[PDB]
A paper describes a structure:
The protein Roquin (encoded by Rc3h1), known to bind target mRNAs and promote their decay, has been found to be crucial in the maintenance of peripheral immune tolerance. Roquin is a ubiquitously expressed RING-E3 ubiquitin ligase family member containing a highly conserved ROQ domain required for RNA binding and localization to stress granules and a CCCH zinc finger motif. Roquin binds a stem-loop structure termed the constitutive decay element (CDE) within the 3′-UTR of Tnf mRNA and recruits the Ccr4-Caf1-Not deadenylation machinery leading to mRNA decay. mRNA degradation can also be mediated by Roquin’s recruitment of Rck/Edc4/Dcp1a decapping complexes and is thought to occur independently of miRNA activity. Our work identifies a role of the immune modulator Roquin in regulating mammalian miRNA homeostasis by promoting mature miR-146a degradation.
Residue numbers in the entry: 177 to 261, 264 to 327
The structure:
Amino acid sequence: QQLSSNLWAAVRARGCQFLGPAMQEEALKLVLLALEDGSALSRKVLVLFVVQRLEPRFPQASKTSIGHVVQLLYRASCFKVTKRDSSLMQLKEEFRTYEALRREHDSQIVQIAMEAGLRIAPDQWSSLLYGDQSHKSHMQSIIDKLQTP
């Protein structure tokens, strides 16, 4: 798809990455593993935690690519950041379950598509983000919220 290619180019243009439906899911679940309980990790340590556990099952995982995944979450305003002179990152309380964090994640990607002027329907979103046709109403719901006049 040209559509997919333009979307991911748009995502990369903003310092972010989507690693693919299977890999991104596991990445996000590992972010949760580290931050569920409100632990406060630097970006370095968060990336390290996730790459460490992701790479065994998805060997192409890197500090660079997972940094770009975390940046996507940062851009989605998922973190409470405590600055210091090296900042520490906490998952906002409202996003400490997978479905909630994943929803904010997807929504940020839909915002990016909107910025990039890319018109994408829910069945396409379901393919792009989940690699199935079982997430249409999830994506449609995200779209509805972003399309308030």
